[PDB]
Design a protein around this ligand. Sequence first.
Ligand SMILES: *[C@@H]1O[C@H](CO)[C@@H](O[C@@H]2O[C@H](CO)[C@@H](O)[C@H](O)[C@H]2NC(C)=O)[C@H](O)[C@H]1NC(C)=O
Lengths: 406, 388, 387, 425, 409
Amino acid sequence: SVMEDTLLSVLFETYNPKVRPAQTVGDKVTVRVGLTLTNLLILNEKIEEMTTNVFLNLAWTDYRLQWDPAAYEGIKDLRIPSSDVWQPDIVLMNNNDGSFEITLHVNVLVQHTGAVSWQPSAIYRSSCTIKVMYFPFDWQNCTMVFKSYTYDTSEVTLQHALDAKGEREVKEIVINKDAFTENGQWSIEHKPSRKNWRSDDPSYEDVTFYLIIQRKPLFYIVYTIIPCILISILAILVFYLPPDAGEKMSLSISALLAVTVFLLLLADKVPETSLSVPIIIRYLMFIMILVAFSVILSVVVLNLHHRSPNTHTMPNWIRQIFIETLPPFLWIQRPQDLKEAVEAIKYIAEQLESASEFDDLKKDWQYVAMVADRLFLYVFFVICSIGTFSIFLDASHNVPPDNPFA
Amino acid sequence: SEHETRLVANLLENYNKVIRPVEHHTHFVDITVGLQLIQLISVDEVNQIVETNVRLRQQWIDVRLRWNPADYGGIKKIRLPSDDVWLPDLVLYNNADGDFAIVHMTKLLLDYTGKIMWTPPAIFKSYCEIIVTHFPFDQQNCTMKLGIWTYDGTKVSISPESDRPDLSTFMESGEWVMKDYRGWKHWVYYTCCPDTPYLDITYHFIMQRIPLYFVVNVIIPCLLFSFLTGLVFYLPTDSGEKMTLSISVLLSLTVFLLVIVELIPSTSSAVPLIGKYMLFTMIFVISSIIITVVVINTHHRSPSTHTMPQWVRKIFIDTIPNVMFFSTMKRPDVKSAIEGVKYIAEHMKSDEESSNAAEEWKYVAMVIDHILLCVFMLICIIGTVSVF
Amino acid sequence: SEHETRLVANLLENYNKVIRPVEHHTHFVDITVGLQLIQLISVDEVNQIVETNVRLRQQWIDVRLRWNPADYGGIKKIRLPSDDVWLPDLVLYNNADGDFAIVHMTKLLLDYTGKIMWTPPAIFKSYCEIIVTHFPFDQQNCTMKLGIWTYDGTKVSISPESDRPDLSTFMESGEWVMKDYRGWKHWVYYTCCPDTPYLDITYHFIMQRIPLYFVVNVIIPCLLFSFLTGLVFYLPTDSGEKMTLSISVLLSLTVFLLVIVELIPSTSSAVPLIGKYMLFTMIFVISSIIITVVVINTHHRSPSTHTMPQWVRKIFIDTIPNVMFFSTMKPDVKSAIEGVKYIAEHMKSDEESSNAAEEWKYVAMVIDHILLCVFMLICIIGTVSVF
Amino acid sequence: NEEERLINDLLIVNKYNKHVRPVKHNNEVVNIALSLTLSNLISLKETDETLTSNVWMDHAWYDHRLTWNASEYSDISILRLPPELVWIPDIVLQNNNDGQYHVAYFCNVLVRPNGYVTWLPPAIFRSSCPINVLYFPFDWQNCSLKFTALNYDANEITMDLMTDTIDGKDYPIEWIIIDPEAFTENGEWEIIHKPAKKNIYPDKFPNGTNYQDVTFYLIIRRKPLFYVINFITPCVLISFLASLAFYLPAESGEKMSTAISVLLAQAVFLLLTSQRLPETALAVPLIGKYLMFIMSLVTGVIVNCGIVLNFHFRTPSTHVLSTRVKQIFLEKLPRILHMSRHDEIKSGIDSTNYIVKQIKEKNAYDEEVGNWNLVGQTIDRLSMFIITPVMVLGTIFIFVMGNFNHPPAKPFEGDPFDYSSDHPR
Amino acid sequence: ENEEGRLIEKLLGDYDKRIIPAKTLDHIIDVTLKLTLTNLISLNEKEEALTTNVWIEIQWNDYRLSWNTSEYEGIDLVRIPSELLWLPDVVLENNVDGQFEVAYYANVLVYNDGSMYWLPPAIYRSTCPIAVTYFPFDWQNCSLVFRSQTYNAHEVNLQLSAEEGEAVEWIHIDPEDFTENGEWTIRHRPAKKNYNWQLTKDDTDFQEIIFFLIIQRKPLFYIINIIAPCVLISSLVVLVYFLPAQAGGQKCTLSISVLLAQTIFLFLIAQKVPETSLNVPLIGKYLIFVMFVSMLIVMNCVIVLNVSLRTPNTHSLSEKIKHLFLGFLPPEIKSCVEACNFIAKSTKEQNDSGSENENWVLIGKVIDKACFWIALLLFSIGTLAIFLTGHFNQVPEFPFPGDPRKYVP
Ligand SMILES: *[C@@H]1O[C@H](CO)[C@@H](O[C@@H]2O[C@H](CO)[C@@H](O)[C@H](O)[C@H]2NC(C)=O)[C@H](O)[C@H]1NC(C)=O
């Protein structure tokens, strides 16, 4: 309308958007600062950056932008391009990339009292310090630190935004159910907002928005933990294979290689920080070492099973432990020509008897291998079972605190 | 503010930002340059680029921008867009993947005395000569060389605020430890311009890698497979599985080689000790495979075609077994029927002789194999004690 | 130059770059559009985007920018910034990952007659429908649809400079060969705009892939591992390595099928012949593993519990073997007396049971020789066919 | 050229303000008609849950300031002005993934003498599309492009769907327009539904910019032939080799190797499938469910092969073949499973009696070892008959439940309108 | 008072930066051009792009920007932002990205005589068609082609700079600011003006300044981390001829696993070399060769296992085969009596069968010996030949084979 043109011309006749509106020298401009989250897009743990789609709700008062509505056809407010008015340089200080400012410069809403509200949109990428200790059963504490890049506390005073009814402050991120998409990998547990100062810097003030998000680990469970549980089952089973099968090495080594491959391909999805080892990596390394000891003890059992009196003499302690004491506990207890012909028969018989004695001793060696293998089966079942249970119980007992502390 | 509106109108009414802020063209602009490290974003070892989030604090006097506070309501400081005043063309010489100069033209603080305080943000992606020789236990020393591009020392002089960069608001990396950091000013005399000095400040950061991540994720698995390398020697030949174990160890080690070669730059200026040790352990695994093949061949020697040499008999059966004290080794028609029994007896006798010879060959194979096992375990002991 | 400075001041004095360069608003400015392909940067098969370095040569007459050379020291040509004059809005319709229009606003040449020559550079990332049928021996046909966006044919007409793009400065790819390339002008009626025709020129390039990288890196390993399939058939059961060999072949073939999967788009428009052939080869290897398991089971048939049926005897013992031309197949003493008799009887029974076991082993051997000859015949016919 | 004079009169003479809504009175409302033309569904990256679209976003509003008497000028029925000179509505894609809210190319607006402004810029939009992996690769997605007007509240400008006239009556274009002359089919995604809605949120006020948007939905069914041919078929065959592993004799020496190799192949397929989907927790994909089921079944197969081997290699010297075990695994199950079936002379006499006794006990030992062999064979046959059916039926059921998954034939369950281009309401 | 203010306001006042500073109609602007390479950041093989941190010295004369030093307190040199002046639109044409222009628009040094001196820095990514034939012993020949994007040869004359009268026909490498790449050694760095005689003196592409970077790979990294592991693992196939040809010998196991390792190494090489199909990399040729040899050795192992495990049941051991392979290359009493006779006879036949089995095993061993020698020779010669060809890949002595000149400072 023409009246809007006249009002804009009178408003910005001598208005300088370079100059912070301070009616008297020394005045501070109060800046409501609030955040509306429309989408928590990504929490890229490899580069420790959270990507969010937010509306930054800002409100301040520019005394220069005042008019009487009755003198201008009752125009109570205007939508003005944001570049034409002074704005506080509110930026995301902890942005991971170099993008400090908003993306969308929407029009500011200027009311006749000078109350300027501004709700620009931005796809922000903030640096979030990832605690890997319990990944993927982890809850991250990602913050979006907002403050004026230019003005300090002596120039602007940051405050919390107001709710729809301008009655009480909203000390949290606003989530509009109508416009908000759940991540599907993260559930927002706490979303408080708080002003922070620095005791070593009286000129510093910011508004920090905290996002206490808990990972939903179904993906990692299904794709890393269950396969590794199956591989650990196989590693246990290797101690039930008879050494005569000639396949204990195949089974144990395949389990070791499978667990190692799982660790290698999981290394791509875990952060590269070195402040702690994630519960998943600790579990995978546990299973790797257990399977390596499975390979070692399968080699030992194969060695025992293939000894013979022609190569080894059985020591007394192995006989004592693995023949009597252990098996009960494991329930695994077990005419010249006629003279020449008679000499031939005698030789055949004594040769058969010698073979029988040799076979008895070789069977003692095989029984020792069997008993040791059963002992290892039980020990490894117990170790794998309770170690896995303990690790995953520890992971399960990891939830964000009821009070966000901020 | 009406006072500040008038002040900004007056300060820039006839102000030309193309001109240096000196009262005489012979004078030089004194800029106090101070680098503030906010975050060490990344150290791209393969590409040898270090991304840092910094604030480039710059201070200088612009006497053209002086006023008297009494005539403007006592205003002593204003924020003024950096695009309105003269700014130093301060360039990062060793830029590799980003911007050479400041691109975020943030507002600058101006005193009534003409003192400017401009602290624009930047993401310095500087070239970093990565020394991959103690990876992952390496410390990297790479710098950020800052200088005025088109002015020499006689026109624009840059000096550091302090002998070190500012790390007061530095966020801990989680991958790197900042051991040292210093800022050195240098006077250079290029060939272009052999008369006047060119100034630049080189901020270097001595960074120590935190090796836990790579230790756990790369070194521990390779150590496990290297240890299993020598376990083939305790595996009996009769199992028919020595090749399975040794070759699986080798396959795992080549997979880890594939993983490792993509973690470090392809530079040959220095041989990465991780790569050297991978090559050494792979030569060890290859030697283990060769020797286990020799042991398998010996174990299956046929006494029919092979007779044990006397030296083999004296070495592997007579002396070495007596050295290993911790090993449990040892050290009418009836004429036709009679002739048939005789043949059975004599053939079984010859079979017993052949079996004894074969058992001797197997004993030699076992002794060789046990010697190799002891050698490998001695290597393990000396290695593990050495690292301590 | 003083003359050129004054000339440029005069031309652009009253010039409004918002108006079309036509004397009468019912006329149309005719633009000669030529596409010069400087480089085929990339062909993203998985994403079906072709990135090319081009210069979009555009020529037209701007009557408002005429001058008399004699009045300006004989100046006949000048270079003007593109942003200073009216330009046509040529938009790459099939843009996929870049800019729809020109963004490099380079200086344009202007004759004293008003004849403008503007050849801005551009990196066109256009959508390219990839045909994967004959990968990696495929040739691709995908285009650049250029047309004036907001002006219909009655206001701004574009005509191709030549029948074909200009590849005189084309830098050779090393992944593709430009078999053919041509440019076609179309009068298109859109649903937006049914009354009047919108003009575009669709340049298209028939580019043939150079199949050596993929040959060496995929096909040859695939051929080697697939040829190892008949060996398991020639490999005796007694070696205890038939499953090892056949399964290793199968796993490697699966790995290579997945590698190929990573190289082609997930579109179902057609089935790649390389993927189809490797799926068939996997099916054959799996059938060979099934038959190898059957052969191994046959070789170990205990004669006690398994009696060879006559349909097996007559066929595998008496029928095929003669057909295999090239193979070379085929008081107290009484106790002692009773004991010797028992030993002899049991040795006889063991001989009979062995003979049955070797009959089973012969059956297995002939089965696996039949499979070996089948595989060899398939290999011969395949190598003949590809030649 | 009187376009010069007309544009001068409209913009400079009339002091046209680009930053003022085209309304005569402030309380009036600008009606922005909005439609979307889809020219190419460039991609739907499931890992990044992003839909990349090549669209022409059509705007139509009335600007009374850009009216002119066509006769006063040489008859000029239309006029092209750059959007940087006229007031345009800043309709922004709210649910974009990157920072690209607006359109890519700001093409000229078209103005008629009645003030009717039409703006049809092209855009590459990368919007957020949450992915339902539940039935992957037999899945259909529901992607939407939500366009809002953040520069003016609903009291100032009203977004609407563009209307079209067929036989004198105007009907709203309630769908994404697809032009056969300008639409490229996606080789992986087939468009089933493409409705457009003007949503109003009554819980919000017209005072704000979040009161009203225009959303274009795009229900697309994946074409699964690629994944079926290259992922599902190899996995199914390699899995069936696991069941085949029961037919290998225990003396083959390769039963466990076969089963383990099948398990590793299935694990490889699981990991490559894992890399092709987003890391969400809404559901385990159909192929993921099948792979978990088949990997568990093949682990059971490996355990059963280990048990069969353990039984096969038993001997009387370490285990006793119990009568219960004999009765079950050698008599009963076989039939149910239909399985096939003078100082000299006394010394010499003593030696031969001893030889006979040794050979006789050896024969008994071998007979018991053979009984153990048959027990193992019975166990592996039973396990074959018990696990091959489970494998086959699980495979068939899972991959038939996938094919019995189609979009619901109507978007917006509670709505009976088809939102089809060939039947406007 | 800063007299530069008045001087620059006089110069830039009434100065048009769209106008080429040609004094008369026939005047041609000489645009001297010098390149200073401070860092060869990378040669991205996959995308065939050379990234360099270069300072490009561009010198021309703008007669409009000349003054009388005596009239301005002796000032003879001013700095004017390059965005306010006419520039010869010198660009990098062979750029992979769309980055034609310099990275940072530094000030222009303007001298009182009109001499203009511009030394902007740039991060240029230029197309380097990579020859893989001798990878990793290869040397690449990368080119930075510069030319005016706007002005033809009738109005701009591109030339190489010259100090003390001699043309600088090489990329300048300043010791005060230059970093050795560590993977690439600069062997030659010539610069020359080039003409496109297919184009006329017009067309803006007729003339160009080309700066060449002939760089040699340092192959120690690739040797140690790929070739040495590759050769060592590939040398394991010959070991199969010493394993027993029977169950538990794991002959095919070893050979097949070596083949798999070689395949893994092929995948490794895939990530180090470009996807171009003009040539096969030397290491790629070696991998193909050793994979083929390992397939032949797997065939050989299968054949030996088939021969060794032959039995009288299956195959008849021909006398001629034995000659060739082992001669050149290497009532109670009566019942008890019949029982004893049968026992002896059966034992004798069983032992004869065993003997013939042993003879087949001996033939298999002989074949293993001969085939081992053949395979060892084949593998050794192939490795030596291929990697000696890699070793003998030399960077040409002269930057241009025709030119006798060295093109060095
Ligand atoms: C926009 O309109 C809504 C509804 O008319 C206004 O909501 C009112 O806000 C005032 C101020 O706090 C309250 O006293 C009223 O009770 C609210 N009314 C209702 C119905 O909730 C809102 O304030 C208006 N906002 C602007 C910027 O004009």
